[PDB]
Write a protein that binds this DNA or RNA. Structure first.
Ligand SMILES: [Zn+2]
Lengths: 129, 205, 156, 121, 50, 82
RNA sequence: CCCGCAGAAGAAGCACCGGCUAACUCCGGCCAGCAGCCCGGUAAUACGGAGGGUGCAAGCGUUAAUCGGAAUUACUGGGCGUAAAGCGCACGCAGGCGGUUUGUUAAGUCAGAUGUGAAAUCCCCGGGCUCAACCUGGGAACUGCAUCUGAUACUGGCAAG
């Protein structure tokens, strides 16, 4: 059975980047979608597009630079068997900051550095690099 | 608590001139500075990684005349302090009263300086300081007291110093026989041959 | 200009009809005190020739690196077959912290101020290979700015 | 290895036994030598190794190697022992120069380690 | 002579990239001037222009 | 009761007193309610060897407290220092 | 604590030098001997002695014991095809986990504040003993607990899908 779709999304992205697929697609969700927002906002993806009424289908379009993939690495941090909450002062850096770490906060989803600026911690969803 | 033996032997062992003798007479004339001490001097096989580090450590220790526990303590202090660990250590070493005196030129050798310090010749801010390990601070004037000012050795030392170029981080007066420790020295001011990093590594085993 | 460090030598043997025929292996490495680095692993009946062979091999098949002023550009891992490696850029003055062959590779690489430990096997050869790997994988902030279509300030 | 399993039954610390229990955590202990004698080593050595069975203060009976060239030891000979095993069934070392044990004769190096006085000359 | 007509600090080292008295016998630190030498550290023809 | 007294907190031959409010029955350097100042007998010149938080004193006495003689002596000195 | 007197005067050992591991030569027969792990049978840098040397230093060594290294119980931080390691196979309570959308709550969770969190100890900045040790002002911290006010992304619960 499916226990974590955020995980499934990250894996699918990983494999599409691995396989030189232009895009990748999967069932759509709100959190999934705000994550896609984020990633675009940080320019690891070219664009996402959700489609469907009933069981809508999210479609990420992947990004390749000088051939190689652009999401060097992507790895979940919290998870249903083990969640990972942090205080603002406790926010990690991804790749010494050359990367990002997606985080949910009470003010929606967003990367680590935006969170720092805002001044509030939350749930570290995943590192991207 | 002090090394009382042959000084040039140590130098020989190290490889370099450690400045353990005044410098009236050149070190090559006094001893086989290239050849290592003992029966098996001429033989010189390449040392190990540990060994080189150890040697380096010894050199520095030898130069200043600091035994091992004290050295370790100094290292620890340096580590604790903010900034480049090795350079901090170096600074600390410099800061020693005897070393400062030597730099100024009131002692021919560091040993001489140390002796002077011991024998209540030197004052730091007009107060007789007897400890060779006393860490002299910025803007701390350090002078020969009026009793020890008549000594022929002191003037000789001064003369010797003069032949040698002066350190930028001090300011000394030959007539007044009082020098001001203006600031703690920068790494650039000290000798380049000392690999502080090796020393640091040795203690970071 | 280029300096060079013979890290390790080891005697090795071939069993034959007659007996044990010994040769020797030489693991050297070189760097120009800048990003470039390269290692040579030569073999010969006699040591001098083996090391000369490794010096040849290292001189070529070098590899460039992005080195922040005297140190790395970020914490990295790098692995070869039993020697996994974690290095972390370290403050000026700290010196090169590392055990052995790794110390040498860094030393020739020109880096000065690091924190480096080695997980797993310490076989000189594999671990130096892991070092060169973790140094090659490493990217500089400008280079991320490039990959991602951005200004460096955008990344800070 | 599971978190829950460790919860259920936690990790167990390997208790190593002391290899000198007769000392019972005493740096030394006194004894009387029920019998002195020598014994032969397991392959690949060849010696007539001097040794003595000692009934201890505490009531343990054990056997003690004897360091040095020549001892004075007898039965009903009050001795001290320190520990240290010789490479069978022997784990303990006689402190030369202690309570009946002489110091080795005519030794000049490691005079401490066999209880021998500085020479005077 | 230190420091006479034919000085060390005022002009340069007689030998190329060498402290005439004693330090720097390779090609790494060209320039350092220790207390024991009161000497610059450059080429053999550097004294001809100074 | 609760008395304002001294506590020898220093080094051999070099006492350095902390004045404290503490219940009487407690040991000298033992359980103290609170610390209202200090006394440095061996104070050098150009340093304040003595310092007292007078209101906190003044509160406690009104709470109905007893004052060591020395502590009294020290208060006077300050009022006269003043 | 200071002042006066005399004169180098009254003041250096331990351990080791096969490798690990800094330190090498000569002289004496698998014995005597060494040894932490991996020498000795006639040329022993590994036994004993001398020489020389290395490292510590009013101490130096052994023994004892704890943590380390040991990621060698692996939370951080391990593994199980052949090296130890998948139940012989199933059902299945307890138990752990839980697709998706809306609504709510605020329990976990984050934010802010109050209370506490002895003193001492650690450390940061200072002061005082001729320095240090030591004493010592002020901070910081004491990761925590309780109580208030909030946030609602998630997890949770309640209601509908
Ligand atoms: Zn020079």
């Amino acid at each position: 059975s499916m226990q974590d779709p955020i995980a499934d999304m990250l894996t699918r992205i990983r494999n599409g980047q691995a396989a030189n697929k232009a895009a990748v697609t999967m069932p759509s969700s709100k959190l999934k979608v705000a994550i896609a927002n984020v990633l675009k906002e940080e320019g690891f993806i070219e664009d996402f597009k959700v489609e469907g009424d009933t069981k809508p289908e999210l479609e990420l379009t992947l990004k390749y630079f000088q051939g190689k993939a652009v999401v060097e690495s992507i790895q979940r941090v919290s998870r249903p068997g083990l969640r990972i909450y942090k205080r603002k002062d406790e926010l990690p850096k991804v790749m010494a900051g050359l990367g990002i770490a997606v985080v949910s906060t009470s003010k929606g989803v967003m990367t680590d550095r935006a969170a720092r600026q805002a001044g509030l911690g939350g749930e570290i969803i995943c590192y991207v690099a | 608590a002090r090394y009382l033996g042959p000084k040039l032997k140590l130098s020989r062992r190290e490889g370099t001139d450690l400045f353990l003798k005044s410098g009236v007479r050149a070190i090559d004339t006094k001893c086989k500075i290239e050849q290592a001490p003992g029966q098996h001097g001429a033989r010189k096989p390449r040392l190990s990684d540990y060994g080189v580090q150890l040697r380096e450590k010894q050199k520095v220790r030898r130069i200043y005349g600091v035994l091992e526990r004290q050295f370790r303590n100094y290292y620890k202090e340096a580590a604790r302090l903010k900034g480049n660990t090795g350079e901090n250590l170096l600074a600390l070493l410099e800061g020693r009263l005897d070393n400062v005196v030597y730099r100024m030129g009131f002692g021919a050798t560091r040993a001489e300086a140390r002796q002077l310090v011991s024998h209540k010749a030197i004052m730091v801010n007009g107060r007789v300081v007897n400890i060779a390990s006393y860490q002299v601070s910025p803007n701390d004037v350090v002078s020969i007291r009026e009793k020890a000012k008549k000594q022929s050795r002191v003037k000789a030392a001064l003369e010797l110093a003069e032949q040698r170029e002066k350190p930028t981080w001090l300011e000394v007066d030959a007539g007044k026989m009082e020098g001001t420790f203006k600031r703690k020295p920068e790494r650039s001011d000290l000798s380049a041959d000392i690999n502080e990093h090796l020393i640091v590594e040795l203690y970071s085993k | 200009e280029l300096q060079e460090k013979l890290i390790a030598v080891n005697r090795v043997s071939k069993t034959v009809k007659g007996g044990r025929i010994f040769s020797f292996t030489a693991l050297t490495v070189v760097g120009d005190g800048n990003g470039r680095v390269g290692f040579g692993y030569g073999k010969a009946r006699e040591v001098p020739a083996a090391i000369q062979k490794a010096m040849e091999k290292a001189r070529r098949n070098m590899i460039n690196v992005a080195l922040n002023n005297g140190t790395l550009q970020h914490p990295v891992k790098g692995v070869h077959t039993g020697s996994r490696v974690f290095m972390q850029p370290a403050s000026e003055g700290t010196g090169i912290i590392a055990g052995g062959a790794m110390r040498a590779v860094l030393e020739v690489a020109g880096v000065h101020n690091v924190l480096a430990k080695a997980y797993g096997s310490t076989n000189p050869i594999n671990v130096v290979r892991a070092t060169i790997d973790g140094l090659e994988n490493m990217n500089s902030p400008e280079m991320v700015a490039a990959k991602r279509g951005k200004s460096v300030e955008e990344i800070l | 290895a599971t978190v829950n399993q460790l919860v259920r039954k936690p990790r167990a610390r390997k208790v190593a036994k002391s290899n000198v229990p007769a000392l019972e955590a005493c740096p030394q202990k006194r004894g009387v030598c029920t019998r002195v004698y020598t014994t032969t080593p397991k392959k690949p050595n060849s010696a007539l190794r001097k040794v003595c069975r000692v009934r201890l203060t505490n009531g343990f009976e054990v056997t003690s190697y004897i360091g040095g060239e020549g001892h004075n030891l007898q039965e009903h000979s009050v001795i001290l022992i320190r520990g240290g095993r010789v490479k069978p069934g022997v784990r303990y070392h006689t402190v030369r120069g202690a309570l009946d044990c002489s110091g080795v004769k005519d030794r000049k190096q490691a005079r401490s380690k066999y209880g021998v006085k500085r020479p005077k000359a | 002579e230190r420091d006479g007509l034919f000085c060390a600090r005022i002009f340069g080292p007689v030998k190329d990239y060498e402290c005439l008295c004693g330090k720097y016998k390779r090609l790494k630190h060209r320039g350092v001037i220790c207390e024991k030498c009161g000497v610059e550290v450059t080429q053999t023809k550097v004294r001809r222009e100074r | 009761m609760v008395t304002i007294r001294l506590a020898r907190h220093g080094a051999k031959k070099r006492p350095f007193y902390q004045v404290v409010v503490a219940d009487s029955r407690n040991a000298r350097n033992g359980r103290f309610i609170e610390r209202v100042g200090f006394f440095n007998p061996i104070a050098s010149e150009k340093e304040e060897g003595t310092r007292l938080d007078l209101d906190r004193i003044a509160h406690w006495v009104g709470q109905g407290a007893t004052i060591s003689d020395r502590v009294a002596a020290l208060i006077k000195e300050v009022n006269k220092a003043a």
